[PDB]
Design a binder for this molecule. Structure first.
Ligand SMILES: [Cl-]
Ligand SMILES: [Cl-]
Length: 162
């Protein structure tokens, strides 16, 4: 298992514009297009991201390319973030993937906000961090996925994904 396979299970991969769990226009593997309610604006962003008039439809290769870029950007976002970097550096490989997943889903800013959990993860207090992470809108809105990421941070294994 790895970050790509992990996120592939969490986000899926749709070749048409769709609405995410929050009702926003997205495409591919969780690639957010816009928070605006306009399909047009969505199609515009998609074409600009792909580099062609897509008409709301992309191929698998195109989806995968967006996916790769998005994973690379999450990592780089983590490394550039003063609050995130230190945590990431302190973790083992499986847990780093869990942190990438959260960032991919909620953005660098969102995650940097779990101040207390981050401190706990950095201290390797696994069970504590898991309980703290669960007291959040994130867990209440997308519980199954949150459970999967949380168990990952708790156990340091891919069990929740196998
Ligand atoms: Cl883009
Ligand atoms: Cl869920």
């Amino acid at each position: 298992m790895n970050i790509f396979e992990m996120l592939r299970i969490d986000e899926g991969l749709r070749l048409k514009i769709y609405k995410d769990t929050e009702g926003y226009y997205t495409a591919g593997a969780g690639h957010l297009l816009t928070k605006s309610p306009s399909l047009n604006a969505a199609k515009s962003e998609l074409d600009k991201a792909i580099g062609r008039n897509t008409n709301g439809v992309i191929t698998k290769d195109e989806a995968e390319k967006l996916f790769n870029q998005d994973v690379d950007a999450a990592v780089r976002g983590i490394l550039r973030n003063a609050k995130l970097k230190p945590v990431y550096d302190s973790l083992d490989a499986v847990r780093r993937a869990a942190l990438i997943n959260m960032v991919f889903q909620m953005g660098e800013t969102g995650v940097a906000g779990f101040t207390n959990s981050l401190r706990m993860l950095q201290q390797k207090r696994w069970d504590e961090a898991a309980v703290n992470l669960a007291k959040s809108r994130w867990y209440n809105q997308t519980p199954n996925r949150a459970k999967r990421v949380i168990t990952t941070f708790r156990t340091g294994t891919w069990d929740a994904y196998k």
